[PDB]
Amino acid sequence: SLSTEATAKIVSEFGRDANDTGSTEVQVALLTAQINHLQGHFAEHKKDHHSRRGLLRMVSQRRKLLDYLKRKDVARYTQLIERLGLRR
Amino acid sequence: SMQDPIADMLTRIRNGQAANKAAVTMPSSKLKVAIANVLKEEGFIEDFKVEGDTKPELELTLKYFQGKAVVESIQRVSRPGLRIYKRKDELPKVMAGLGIAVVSTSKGVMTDRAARQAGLGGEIICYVA
Amino acid sequence: FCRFTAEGVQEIDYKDIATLKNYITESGKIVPSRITGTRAKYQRQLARAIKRARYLSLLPYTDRHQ
Amino acid sequence: ESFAQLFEESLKEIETRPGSIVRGVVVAIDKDVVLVDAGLKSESAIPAEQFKNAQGELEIQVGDEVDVALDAVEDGFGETLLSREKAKRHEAWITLEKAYEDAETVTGVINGKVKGGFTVELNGIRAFLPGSLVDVRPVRDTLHLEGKELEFKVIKLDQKRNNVVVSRRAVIESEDPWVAIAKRYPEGTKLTGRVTNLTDYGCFVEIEEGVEGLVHVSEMDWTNKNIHPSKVVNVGDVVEVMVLDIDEERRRISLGLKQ
Amino acid sequence: PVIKVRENEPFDVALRRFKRSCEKAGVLAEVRRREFYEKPTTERKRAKASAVKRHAKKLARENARRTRLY
Amino acid sequence: TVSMRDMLKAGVHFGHQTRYWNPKMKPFIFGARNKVHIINLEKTVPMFNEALAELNKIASRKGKILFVGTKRAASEAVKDAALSCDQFFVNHRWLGGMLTNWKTVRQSIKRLKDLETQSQDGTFDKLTKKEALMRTRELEKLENSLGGIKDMGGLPDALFVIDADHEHIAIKEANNLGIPVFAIVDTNSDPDGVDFVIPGNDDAIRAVTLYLGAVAATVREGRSQ
RNA sequence: CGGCCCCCUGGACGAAGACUGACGCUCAGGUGCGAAAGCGUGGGGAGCAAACAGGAUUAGAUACCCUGGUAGUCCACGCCGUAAACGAUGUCGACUUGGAGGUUGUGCCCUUGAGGCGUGGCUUCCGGAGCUAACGCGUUAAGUCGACCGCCUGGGGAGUAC
Numbered sequence: 001s002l003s004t005e006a007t008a009k010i011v012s013e014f015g016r017d018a019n020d021t022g023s024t025e026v027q028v029a030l031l032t033a034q035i036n037h038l039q040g041h042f043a044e045h046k047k048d049h050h051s052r053r054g055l056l057r058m059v060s061q062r063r064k065l066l067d068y069l070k071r072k073d074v075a076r077y078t079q080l081i082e083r084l085g086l087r088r
Numbered sequence: 089s090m091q092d093p094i095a096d097m098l099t100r101i102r103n104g105q106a107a108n109k110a111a112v113t114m115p116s117s118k119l120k121v122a123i124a125n126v127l128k129e130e131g132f133i134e135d136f137k138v139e140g141d142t143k144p145e146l147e148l149t150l151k152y153f154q155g156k157a158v159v160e161s162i163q164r165v166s167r168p169g170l171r172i173y174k175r176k177d178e179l180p181k182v183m184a185g186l187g188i189a190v191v192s193t194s195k196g197v198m199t200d201r202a203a204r205q206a207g208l209g210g211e212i213i214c215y216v217a
Numbered sequence: 218f219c220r221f222t223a224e225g226v227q228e229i230d231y232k233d234i235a236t237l238k239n240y241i242t243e244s245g246k247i248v249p250s251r252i253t254g255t256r257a258k259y260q261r262q263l264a265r266a267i268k269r270a271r272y273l274s275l276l277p278y279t280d281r282h283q
Numbered sequence: 284e285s286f287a288q289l290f291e292e293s294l295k296e297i298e299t300r301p302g303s304i305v306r307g308v309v310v311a312i313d314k315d316v317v318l319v320d321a322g323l324k325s326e327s328a329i330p331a332e333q334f335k336n337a338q339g340e341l342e343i344q345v346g347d348e349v350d351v352a353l354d355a356v357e358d359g360f361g362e363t364l365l366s367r368e369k370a371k372r373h374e375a376w377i378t379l380e381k382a383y384e385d386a387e388t389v390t391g392v393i394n395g396k397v398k399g400g401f402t403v404e405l406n407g408i409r410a411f412l413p414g415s416l417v418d419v420r421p422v423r424d425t426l427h428l429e430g431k432e433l434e435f436k437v438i439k440l441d442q443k444r445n446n447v448v449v450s451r452r453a454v455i456e457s458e459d460p461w462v463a464i465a466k467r468y469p470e471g472t473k474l475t476g477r478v479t480n481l482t483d484y485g486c487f488v489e490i491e492e493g494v495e496g497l498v499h500v501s502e503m504d505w506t507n508k509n510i511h512p513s514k515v516v517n518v519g520d521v522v523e524v525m526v527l528d529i530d531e532e533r534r535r536i537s538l539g540l541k542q
Numbered sequence: 543p544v545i546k547v548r549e550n551e552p553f554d555v556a557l558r559r560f561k562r563s564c565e566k567a568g569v570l571a572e573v574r575r576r577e578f579y580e581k582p583t584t585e586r587k588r589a590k591a592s593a594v595k596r597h598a599k600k601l602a603r604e605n606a607r608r609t610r611l612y
Numbered sequence: 613t614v615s616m617r618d619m620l621k622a623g624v625h626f627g628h629q630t631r632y633w634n635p636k637m638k639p640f641i642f643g644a645r646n647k648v649h650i651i652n653l654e655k656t657v658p659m660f661n662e663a664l665a666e667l668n669k670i671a672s673r674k675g676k677i678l679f680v681g682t683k684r685a686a687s688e689a690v691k692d693a694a695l696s697c698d699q700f701f702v703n704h705r706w707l708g709g710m711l712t713n714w715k716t717v718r719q720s721i722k723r724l725k726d727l728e729t730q731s732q733d734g735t736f737d738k739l740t741k742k743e744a745l746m747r748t749r750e751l752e753k754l755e756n757s758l759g760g761i762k763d764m765g766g767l768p769d770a771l772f773v774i775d776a777d778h779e780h781i782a783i784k785e786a787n788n789l790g791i792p793v794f795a796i797v798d799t800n801s802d803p804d805g806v807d808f809v810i811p812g813n814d815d816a817i818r819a820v821t822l823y824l825g826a827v828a829a830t831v832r833e834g835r836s837q
Numbered sequence: 838c839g840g841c842c843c844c845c846u847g848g849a850c851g852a853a854g855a856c857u858g859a860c861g862c863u864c865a866g867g868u869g870c871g872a873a874a875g876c877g878u879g880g881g882g883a884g885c886a887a888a889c890a891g892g893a894u895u896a897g898a899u900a901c902c903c904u905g906g907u908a909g910u911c912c913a914c915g916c917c918g919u920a921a922a923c924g925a926u927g928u929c930g931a932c933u934u935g936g937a938g939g940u941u942g943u944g945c946c947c948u949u950g951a952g953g954c955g956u957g958g959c960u961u962c963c964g965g966a967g968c969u970a971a972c973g974c975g976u977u978a979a980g981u982c983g984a985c986c987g988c989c990u991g992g993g994g995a996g997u998a999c
Contacts, residue, residue: 001846022856041845049870051846056869068860089862089930091983096931099982103933106966106981169984218493218951220458239462242532244543244567248461252534254493254951255458257940272841280544287653290620291645310817324626324648325815356647357629359608360815470548493951528559530566537562579885597962601937635934635965 002034014083024069025080031062032084091168093117097146098162098214104150105157116146122197123190123213124148130188130199132159132216161217165189176209187217221259229259231266234275241267244280298322302352302369309347317343319351323362327351333367337407365519374408378447381437386457391435391449393417393424397473398525400448403435411475413439416448419456427452441466444492446474460493464531467491471542473525481512486540488524494536498524502541516540543567613664614826616653622819624812625651627799637799640811649799656811663794663808664830670770670792671697671834679760679824680782681774682706686820690774693824694760697831700768701760702782711767711785721762724754770794772827775814777801796823 010033012018014026038055042048066088069077081088090096097120104112114120116138124136124146134149151158166172174180174191179200182189189200193210203209221229231237240248240255240263247267250260270276298304298321307319307327317329334349336342343349351366381387393401393412401417401424403410416438417424424431435449436456443459450456467474476490485499501507504515516522528537543563547556564570580588619625627633627641627649642652671677679701681690687703694701702710710717727747730736739747771786773779776795783805786793795806796814803809813819 020856024857027857038846045845048846050848053869054847064860068857089859089984091862091930095983099932102981107933164982167983218459220462223948223950236462239458243530244532246532248532248534253461256951268841284654287625287642287650290625291643291650295645322623324628326817357632358604528562528566533566533568535566594962597938601962631936633935 002030002037006033024065024072025076028062028065028069028080029084031058031065032086034058035062092164093120094123094213095164095167097123098164101148101150101159102162104148105152105159108152109150111147111149113145113147116140116144119192119197120146126190126197126199127216130216159216160187162214164214165212166214172212174209174212176204176207179204179209180212180215182215183217187215189213189215218254219256219259221263222256226259229262229266231269231273231275234270237263237267237270237276241276245277246279294322300353302350302364302366302372305348305350307348307351307363307366309343309345312341312345319349319363319366321351321363323353324357325360325362327363327365328361329365333365370408374405377405378437378440387437388434391433391451392430393435393449393451394430395425397475397523398467399472400439400446401451402475403447403449403451405435409475410445410447410449411473412446412448414448415439417451419450419453422452424451441492444490444494446491460491461531461534464494464529464536467526468529471525471527473523473542474538475521476524476538477519477521478517479519481516481518483511483513486512486516488522488538488540490521495534496524496526496536496538498538498540502539505541543569613830614657614660614822616657618822619653619657619812619819622813622822623816624656624819624822625653626813626816626819627651628815632800634800634802636803637797637801637811640797640803640809641799651799651811651813659808660810660812660826663810664826666792666808667770667772667794667827668830668834668837671831672837675769675834676700676764676766677831678702678764678768678771679827680706680772680779681820683775683778683814683820686774686817686824689817689821689824691760693821693828696825696828697835699760699831700764703760704756706779706781707757708781709785710761711782711789711791714767717758720754721758724751724758725762727751727754767791774820774823775801776803776806776809778814780805796820 007030010030011021011026014029015021015023020026035055035058038051038058042052042055066077066081066086069080080086093115097114100112100114103109121136121138124133127133127148128135132151134151136146136148138144138146179191180189181187182200185201190213191198191200191203191210192213193203193206193208195206195208197213198206200212240253242248247264250257253260255263267276271278298306304321307321307323309317309319310326311318315331317331317334318326319329320326329351331341334341334343349366350369352364352368355364356362377389378387389405391403391405393403395401396414396417397411399414400412401414403412403417416435419436431451433451433454435447435451436453438448438450440447474491476488476496478486478488480487485497486503487495488498489495500510500512503512504510522540523542524538524540525542526536527539527542528535530536543560543566545556545560545563547553625642630644630647630649633641633649637649640651640655642650642654644650667677677697677699679690679694679699681687681701681703682705690701691703694703707717727750730747731751767789768791770792771782771794773782773793773795776783776797777800779795780802783793783795785791787805793805793807794810795801795803795808796810796812797803797806798812798814801814810823812823
């Protein structure tokens with residue numbers, strides 16, 4: 001998983017409240033951090049299909065959050081992707 | 089997931105009548121409620137009561153005559169996978185009319201015979217018998 | 218009537234030999250969950266602790282070996 | 284009304300689960316079945332052998348009141364665990380009474396040790412005690428007139444498993460089972476144990492504080508195979524048994540009865 | 543099952559105890575199960591059938607026990 | 613006629629273990645303290661009274677009454693009660709289709725009566741011993757079975773029963789013939805067959821005796837009418 | 838999928854609370870995993886064992902039995918994609934009498950004891966209504982309802998031929 005303190009950080013940066021924890025942008029970036037962390041493991045271990053499944057689940061949940069965010073509001077979407085450096 | 093609450097209501101009524109439950113309860117809705125109005129108005133039920141502010145809870149009180157249930161049968165006719173609209177001239181009869189068929193029309197919800205009298209068709213929600 | 222449950226121990230110590238010894242066969246097997254009277258949850262901890270001690274030679278695997 | 288609700292909690296208040304409240308009136312006697320009614324769902328099928336006192340004949344006619352026991356309820360139609368155990372609690376209370384003044388006095392008469400402690404019998408029941416308890420010193424009641432009259436002064440009791448060794452003569456003088464299973468061990472320590480259920484291969488006498496003994500079918504008597512243990516001993520009765528074998532590991536203490 | 547004759551211990555008692563000990567260990571039977579290979583399926587089958595039988599005896603026989611024979 | 617305190621004393625309120633109940637008895641149940649169902653006497657008593665009224669009403673029109681019970685613990689009481697108001701009973705086991713297959717049972721009554729006539733009025737002794745034992749064996753069997761009813765002549769005008777679940781055969785038979793049915797119904801039993809159901813304690817002795825005595829007095833009252 | 842340890846890691850459940858606010862179900866095409874056997878290549882090779890040799894039996898015995906026994910079975914990376922891959926029971930959601938269990942939580946209770954009363958999840962058995970051609974299924978349905986997909990149209994020829 002992700003370290004708790006890492007989550008607390010990501011929250012501080014992206015949550016408008018730092019107690020909210022449920023902001024779409026927040027959840028996006030949490031997923032993003034987790035994907036980033038998991039990239040190295042799967043680079044090393046190319047055959048752990050099992051966990052690779054949950055990884056992909058994270059990716060999808062991220063994408064869906066992004067779709068929701070796109071429709072709801074575009075400026076927020078754009079800044080978020082900028083911050084995360086996500087291509088789309 | 090829940091796809092039709094009208095269906096859920098009819099099933100719950102069916103099962104309460106089946107099980108000899110005095111009353112039955114479920115989430116409340118406007119259409120649900122006007123249906124309960126109707127059924128009372130046609131004396132298949134003793135009374136309904138909606139309760140709650142936020143997610144209010146409708147409660148029908150069932151009816152038993154000489155022991156056996158009073159809604160002999162209740163069955164939906166329209167449904168989300170297949171809706172059922174009729175013209176006034178096309179209004180069925182339930183049980184050769186010994187029953188009723190709930191219908192929505194532009195002038196609210198009401199049984200088939202009241203609709204005939206009014207002179208206007210609509211959506212046949214369900215037969216009751 | 219599980220001793221670990223009324224004593225209320227949190228965990229079972231492989232280091233504590235003799236309380237284990239209470240639960241072992243003169244041959245060194247582990248005595249039967251369904252026939253012993255120790256609760257299941259504590260039971261598995263007991264088996265784990267026995268195994269550990271065995272590895273450490275504190276306990277024998279069996280009576281015979283040497 | 285709430286008359287009935289209040290009456291229910293009232294009737295809860297005026298009964299308890301064990302054989303404590305002497306309530307069942309004997310409402311039919313026939314050999315060999317007594318029957319009471321202690322305010323339970325059904326009447327007990329009582330044996331006659333929980334009610335004859337010390338020489339074999341009955342003591343209680345119609346209307347008489349003994350409590351029985353409980354905590355076991357209905358496989359179909361019937362009620363209670365026998366009232367004789369009831370009696371055990373009374374015996375326990377008298378034994379406990381000692382603690383108050385540090386001396387329980389009755390009569391104890393102990394001729395010999397089945398397993399290292401003279402046997403003492405109080406009223407109807409007879410109990411077994413560890414070897415020291417019978418005599419205060421090294422006096423030994425073997426030279427005393429047989430089955431002599433003293434009292435019992437307590438030497439030792441095991442507090443969980445019920446073994447009590449008591450003090451004859453000398454009036455002037457005044458987890459848990461199978462951790463240290465070496466007390467009744469050494470080869471042949473005789474015990475007094477009530478049998479529980481006879482499983483057509485066995486008899487299951489088991490008394491000494493949460494253990495299990497068998498006395499299976501081979502000994503039981505001095506005939507081997509044609510015996511059928513239900514014919515030969517009893518149901519629910521305290522008998523002659525000793526260990527012959529303990530495995531403290533696969534908790535099978537294998538007692539015997541041919542001794 | 544290791545055993546030692548106690549001092550002044552009858553031989554036949556010693557042997558009886560030797561038997562009791564081997565019996566406690568359940569060793570003969572363990573040899574019996576390890577003479578020939580059993581298939582996992584069949585192992586399962588034996589065990590589950592036994593447990594099925596077990597429930598049968600405990601419950602249906604008691605229910606029968608409730609009724610008197612004659 | 614009967615009073616609630618008397619029933620309480622009789623332990624009518626007691627019922628069967630709460631793993632042996634029939635949901636059809638919930639309405640007649642009050643609660644279940646001690647893992648044993650209690651019978652609402654508040655609900656019971658009016659119904660017992662109604663049944664007593666109807667029984668008296670029958671006995672007034674010269675109604676035949678049958679007392680069913682074979683628990684083997686109260687057989688004596690049921691029989692004595694039957695005798696009290698002089699009605700009919702079956703204090704031992706239920707014959708399959710006694711009522712439904714009455715006619716054949718009537719032939720059987722007649723055989724029994726002939727054997728009785730032989731035993732007492734015949735005074736004809738000098739019969740071979742073995743045949744003697746056989747006639748007497750038959751007499752004893754037939755008197756155990758068919759004693760009370762022998763003089764019923766026809767079918768009965770109503771049916772009183774002690775344990776409906778143990779006597780469901782009789783109950784089904786009255787239903788098929790439609791004889792009125794008056795059953796002491798415990799928790800674990802079923803009411804559906806019963807025209808007039810009595811929520812009470814089949815099992816207990818004293819309660820049964822109480823039921824029986826009240827019934828017998830009401831029949832004697834109807835007969836006096 | 839089962840000896841013991843370490844390292845990476847997936848899910849489920851229960852407790853209270855906090856948050857979003859319909860974001861959901863299903864799914865042709867499509868992608869992915871996919872027993873055992875088997876193939877490729879490179880290692881490995883105790884046991885066992887197709888094939889194979891012998892010895893038996895038998896009319897005969899290319900078997901069953903006995904003695905040997907090679908590929909394989911194991912390890913690394915690939916392919917293969919099929920099974921009685923079975924609950925011969927597609928997925929999601931709701932509702933409907935009971936019992937006895939097991940396993941795993943968790944609330945409360947003098948735990949006065951291995952206990953008393955509840956509340957969650959998964960799970961074995963029996964059985965009521967109901968359903969069923971019967972067998973049986975039966976709150977884990979094969980009952981009563983909704984949504985989407987999937988498949989069936991006499992036997993063979995044929996799950997074959999092109």
